[PDB]
């Protein structure tokens, strides 16, 4: 097994609060004197079918928002919307605010989620942004407004806020400026995701992890061109590999002595032949939710 | 996919420190005015081959231990050993000490590890104590003294401290009173683990998780007796299921409407027939490192 490792969550735990509007409670993020949360908190069950968020927000007063940090009520002094994120101004700057920035991540990148229930931290796990801008896998039952982040040197980079579940069970959300990842809207109407694809560069990073962890059976004596690899990739719904992706795998290639295009030849054979009942890192399936950075972080 | 979720790590992050003795640096745990760490910190490479820990410890002065919390040196005022754990008394009580207890967990139970490098928190993941008292899977390269824990209501229950790697790549460690889990010793000599077994009650919890997450193909119209199930289990290196284990699965059985012995009949068929190229929760292998409590924590 190659373990998913989340970032330590302490810096984000001190920012989680509960936001209630009417009968709806979800998670908010308290940074300086602003609480961020999904704007759908202001919607009734009926409102969600076709909301006019500007009109709904105008009809709300500050006293219609109950913000609780532990057992402590924060007074709201201002409410506004930035795209799909509600910003509640409160009268107290969070004394536990970390150094932070707001970033918008790329498809295929990973991040940690602090899964919260009604403002209370419950668990932490590592998630990948799928190429179709959904988040796949199992989630904490009832967890709206939970946030995704990376820790850079001292700095928390917030990249994601959970808004929506698609009937398939996958999650959709926004960056912390309230822009959805992918084609989704915060309305209860028919929404399809695009076809998903396998994140090739992550599969290669995970094969490097396998090698570093002594799982080598799939290495073959062959090489390929980027062009010949990509013809096979396309047939198996893999993303095309670019020179920039090859360059990202440089450190794992140096650590293992296996040229990227040699690992590409190994992956081509695995796609064409299958595993013949064998496992890699205890899996019968190739894994694509570890980035090259995730592997180097854990393995170097 | 059914996600491994770790406990939020913030309460433990504030306790991690670096301990150095000569050229050896590893992790320590700073609770009130005591730093806990593996006693093998006092050993040279040569000492590890056959250490007399009492003699080695007598030859150490307080000034031979360098304890750093961030960039901050703590003065050691006392050194003693409890079984395989070194206790450094320091002149400052940790102001970030959480409510805590020390527990000794059972084989098959899970816990979160805050993986640290030279006192610095790096990542958090969920681990299971194998029936042979090893910890399996991939680990942070260089991480000695990292601790395992559960969070109970407000209270951190520390259960594990990493000491050793076995040549197979698995980890061995102690409880926080310095007693090894399993037959292992903190000496560089030939040590075998017992044969490992599959944690049956955890496989059943994970099949309940599958059902709750809409993966139902393996459910069959059959039941079994505990006795007839156990005859099959024994052949596939599964732990025998006891009435006490059946009772632990009550809540998942109630949530799904599937009797425990009906899920046992489903598992008997999976062991005898295999998966025929199908997956459960995105896995081709049955997973045994989620406890019934882990599933209820995430799914209820």
Domain that holds residue B58: 11-90
For this experimental structure, what is the resolution in angstroms?
1.8
Tell whether the torsion through CA atoms of B176, B179, B183 and B184 is positive or negative. positive
Cα B126 from chain centre: 7
CATH number of the domain that residue B25 is part of: 2.40.10.10
Give helix A200-212 / helix A260-273 axis angle, nearest 10°: 100
Within 8 A by CB and 6+ apart from A293, the residues are: none
B285 vs A contacts (CB less than 8 Å): 279, 282-284
Output DSSP code: residue A81. Answer: E
- CA of B136 to nearest chain A CA: how many angstroms apart? 8
Q: How far apart, in whole angstroms, are the C-alpha atoms of residue A88 and residue A35? A: 5
Interface test with A, best of B96, B138, B283 (most A CBs within 10 A): B138
Rounded to 5 degrees, φ, ψ at A234 are -50, -40
- CA–CA separation, A84 vs A185, rounded Å? 9
Residue whose C-alpha is closest to residue A3's, from A181, A126, A154, A133: A126
Retrieve residue A42's tokens: 């202001």
Pairing of strands B34-38, B85-90: antiparallel
Q: Tell me A236's DSSP state.
A: T
Find the angle CA(B205)-CA(B285)-CA(A293) to the nearest 5 degrees. 100
What is the rounded distance in angstroms from the CA atom of residue A184 to the CA atom of residue A181? 7
Rounded Cα distance between A214 and B163, Å, is: 22
C-alpha closest to that of B158 among B176, B145, B173:
B176
Chain A hits for B300, CB-CB cut-off 8 Å, are 141
- Distance (Å) from the alpha carbon of B261 to chain A's nearest alpha carbon: 25
Nearest chain A residue to B1 by CA distance is: A137
Note whether A1 contacts B137, CB cutoff 8 Å.
Answer: yes
Closest chain A C-alpha to B20 CA, distance in angstroms: 22
Q: Which of B225, B213, B300 is nearest to B259 (CA)?
A: B225
- The dihedral built from the CA positions of residue B172, B177, B182 and B186, taken in this order, carries a sign that is positive
Beta-carbon contacts below 8 Å between A and B: 119
Closest residue of chain B to A125, computed from CA coordinates:
B5
Query: Do B57 and B81 touch, CB atoms closer than 8 A?
Result: yes
Q: Alpha-carbon distance A294 to B226, whole Å?
A: 43
**How far does CA A232 lie from the centroid of its chain?**
28
Using CA atoms, how far residue A251 sits from A128, B1, B182, B262, in Å, is: 21, 29, 38, 50
**Deposited experimental method:** X-ray
CATH of the domain at B285: 1.10.1840.10
Instruction: Return d(Cα A23, Cα A81) in angstroms, integer.
Output: 20
Q: Which of B15, B40, B43, B162 is catalytic?
A: B40
Sign of the dihedral through C-alpha A4, B12, A100, A38? positive
User: Which among A1, A2, A10 is the top mutation candidate for probing chain B, defined by the most B β-carbons within 10 Å of its own β-carbon?
Assistant: A10
Note whether A102 and A83 are within 8 A (CB).
no
Q: Which of A84-97 are b and which e, b meaning 16 or more Cβ less than 10 Å from the residue's Cβ?
A: bbbbbebeeebeeb
CB nearest to A141's CB, from B124, B279, B299: B299
Question: Encoding tokens for residue A273?
Answer: 């032949």
Pair type for strands A100-102 and A66-69: unpaired
Is there a contact between A3 and B283 if contact means CB atoms under 8 Å apart? no
A-chain residues near B283 (CB < 8 A): 283-285
Residue from B1, B6, B256, B277 whose CB has the most chain A CBs within 10 Å, to mutate? B6
Concatenated DSSP letters of chain B: -----BPP-HHHHTTEEEEEETTEEEEEEEETTEEEEEGGGG--TTGGGS--HHHHHHT--GGG-EEEETTEEEPEEEEEEETTEEEEEESS--TTPPSEEE--PPTT-EEEEEEEETTEEEEEEEEE--TTS-B-S---SS-TT-EEEEEETTEEEEEEEEEEE-TTS-EEEE-TTSPBSSS--SSSS--PPPPP-B-HHHHHHHHHHHHHTT--TT--S----HHHHHHHHHHTTBPPP-HHHHHHTHHHHHHHT--HHHHHHHHHHHHHH--TT--BTTBSS------HHHHHHHH-
- Reading the block at residue B96, the tokens are 């970030």
Comparing CA positions, the residue from A62, A57, A58 lying closest to residue A74 is A62
Coil/strand/helix, residue A176: coil
Cβ separation B115–A284 shorter than 8 A: no
* Residue pair B147/B111 in contact by the 8 Å Cβ criterion: no
> What is the C-alpha to C-alpha distance for residues B216 and B125, in angstroms, rounded to an integer?
28
């Amino acid at each position: 097994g190659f373990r998913k490792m989340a970032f330590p969550s302490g810096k984000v735990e001190g920012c989680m609060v509960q936001v209630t509007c009417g009968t709806t409670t979800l998670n908010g993020l308290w940074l300086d004197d602003v609480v961020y949360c999904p704007r759908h908190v202001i919607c009734t069950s009926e409102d969600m079918l076709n909301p006019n968020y500007e009109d709904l927000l105008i009809r709300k007063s500050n006293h219609n928002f109950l913000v609780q940090a532990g057992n402590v009520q924060l007074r709201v002094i201002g409410h506004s919307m930035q795209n799909c994120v509600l910003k509640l101004k409160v009268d107290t700057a969070n004394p536990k605010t970390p150094k932070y920035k707001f970033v918008r991540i790329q498809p295929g990148q990973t991040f940690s989620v602090l899964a919260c229930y009604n403002g209370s931290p419950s668990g932490v796990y590592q998630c990948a942004m799928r190429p179709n801008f959904t988040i796949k896998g199992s989630f904490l039952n009832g967890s709206c407004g939970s946030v995704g982040f990376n820790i850079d040197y001292d700095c928390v980079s917030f990249c994601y806020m959970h808004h929506m579940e698609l009937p398939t069970g996958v999650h959709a959300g926004t960056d912390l400026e309230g822009n959805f990842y992918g084609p989704f809207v915060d309305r209860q109407t028919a929404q399809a995701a695009g076809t998903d694809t396998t994140i090739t560069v992550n599969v290669l990073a995970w094969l490097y992890a396998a090698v570093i962890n002594g799982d080598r059976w799939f290495l073959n004596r062959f090489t390929t061109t980027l062009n010949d690899f990509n013809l096979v990739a396309m047939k198996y719904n893999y993303e095309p590999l670019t020179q920039d992706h090859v360059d990202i795998l440089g450190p794992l290639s140096a650590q293992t002595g296996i040229a990227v295009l040699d690992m590409c030849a190994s992956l081509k054979e695995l796609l064409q032949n299958g595993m013949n009942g064998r496992t890699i890192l205890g899996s019968a399936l190739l894994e694509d939710e570890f980035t090259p950075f995730d592997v180097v972080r854990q393995c170097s």
